[PDB]
Design a protein around this ligand. Structure first.
Ligand SMILES: CCOC(=O)c1cc2cc(-c3cncn3C)ccc2[nH]1
Ligand SMILES: CCOC(=O)c1cc2cc(-c3cncn3C)ccc2[nH]1
Ligand SMILES: [Ca+2]
Ligand SMILES: [Ca+2]
Ligand SMILES: [Ca+2]
Ligand SMILES: [Ca+2]
Ligand SMILES: [Ca+2]
Ligand SMILES: [Ca+2]
Ligand SMILES: [Zn+2]
Ligand SMILES: [Zn+2]
Ligand SMILES: [Zn+2]
Ligand SMILES: [Zn+2]
Lengths: 166, 166
């Protein structure tokens, strides 16, 4: 027999993602690089592995949409809500949605896609918002050139462990 | 940091359920008796008690739906997904939905509702799928043709590890 896990987390370490569509704001290449680096933020401190799929059903389906886009969390046009992601689970679980009424960038203008994605993928892996003001999972956007804060390290390792520690 | 905490088990032994609507396939009486019997499977070997409500909010809301039916876990017409249930918790937690594109029966002409409900209520109470091929919680429907149902030992040990013996 099997009881349900104590916390919402993936039960396998090999996860797949798919970029379903792209923002007008950045090249395909810029978006792919941003997401790849965002996943590496988390794989670097756990045993998780992320492989990209070009079609079909992935564990983490990533898309850009506006207003109503197929869930209970409609976006709201420019400004306000920027993105959201669903906790590990069946079907839409793990999926990450970005509001394409925002301006997404590879730089410090608008919202840096890498940084917001890194935050959203935290949710896709089972992290909620943190009260640690320095945490990646703190619910307020900040821009910098990346090292993952310790609060997020402790959080993600509480779920999946550290993977290779060196 | 914060993770998404799972309610492993119900915090209370006395649970309510409500049959929100009914399948065309069976009489109201047949449906009510199947669900009552499905709960009895679990209450017979634990301290859990189940009482039916006819109106308002209940711990376990039971309904029949087709395709997209309000939770963004859509059913798929005849065959495939038969039903799903949410693990213990608030909101949708505990709720059980049956695909009304399936044929439901009190016998063997279709899917026996009692059996599928007994399995689905296992999920409502915090059981995941078993790997024991003889378990009720094994994810493959089977019908024995016997007038009496005996809860397999795997499921008994499973549910009692959560709630203890009656
Ligand atoms: C909806 C708002 O949530 C976010 O998207 C979000 C992005 C983000 C980035 C940083 C950060 C920047 N440089 C270093 N860190 C740790 C810190 C918190 C953050 N939150
Ligand atoms: C696809 C979802 O899984 C189910 O709906 C399901 C129903 C079911 C019934 C029995 C059974 C019948 N007679 C005695 N047992 C133990 C065993 C396993 C089962 N799984
Ligand atoms: Ca917005
Ligand atoms: Ca998904
Ligand atoms: Ca845009
Ligand atoms: Ca179906
Ligand atoms: Ca409920
Ligand atoms: Ca039907
Ligand atoms: Zn969304
Ligand atoms: Zn967030
Ligand atoms: Zn449903
Ligand atoms: Zn099941």
């Amino acid at each position: 027999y099997n009881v349900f896990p104590r916390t919402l987390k993936w039960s396998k370490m090999n996860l797949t993602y798919r970029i379903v569509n792209y923002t007008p704001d950045m090249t395909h290449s810029e978006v792919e690089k941003a997401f790849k680096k965002a996943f590496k933020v988390w794989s670097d401190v756990t045993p998780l592995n992320f492989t990209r799929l070009h079609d079909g059903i992935a564990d983490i389906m990533i898309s850009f949409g506006i207003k109503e886009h197929g869930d209970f969390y409609p976006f709201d046009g420019p400004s306000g809500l920027l993105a959201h992601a669903f906790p590990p689970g069946p079907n839409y679980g793990g999926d990450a949605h970005f509001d394409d009424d925002e301006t997404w960038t590879s730089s410090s203008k608008g919202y840096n896609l890498f940084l917001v994605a890194a935050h959203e993928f935290g949710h896709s892996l089972g992290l909620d918002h943190s009260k640690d003001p320095g945490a990646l999972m703190f619910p307020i956007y900040t821009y910098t050139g990346f090292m993952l804060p310790d609060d997020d390290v402790q959080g993600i390792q509480s779920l999946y462990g550290p993977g290779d520690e060196d």
